[PDB]
Amino acid sequence: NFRVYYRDSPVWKGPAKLLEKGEGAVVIQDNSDIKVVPRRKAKIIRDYGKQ
């Protein structure tokens, strides 16, 4: 339902699987790697045109 786009360290990377959303960070899986990204550096985008 959701997809997460994020920046490490400038170019936006993604889409990545959303595993968990916290108060100050989000846990995602981009390909085969699990990453912990701060909220300010991640965009969680819902598929709105579908549903």
Ligand X SMILES: Cc1ccc(C2CC2)c(-c2ccc3c(c2C)CCCO3)c1[C@H](OC1CC1)C(=O)O
The site for a copy of itself (CB under 8 A) is made up of 3, 5, 11-15, 43-50
**What does the alpha-carbon distance between residue 51 and residue 37 come to, in Å, rounded to a whole number?**
27
Q: Which does 35 bind (CB under 5 to 8 A by kind): ligand X, a copy of itself, Cl ion, none?
A: none
Quick check: 28 and 34 in contact, CB under 8 A?
A: yes
- Residue nearest Cl ion by beta-carbon distance: 22
Residue written as token pair 């786009």: 5
**Minimum distance, C-beta of residue 30 to ligand X, in the bound complex (Å):** 13
**Minimum distance, C-beta of residue 49 to a copy of itself, in the bound complex (Å):** 2
Determine the 3-state secondary structure of 45 from DSSP: strand
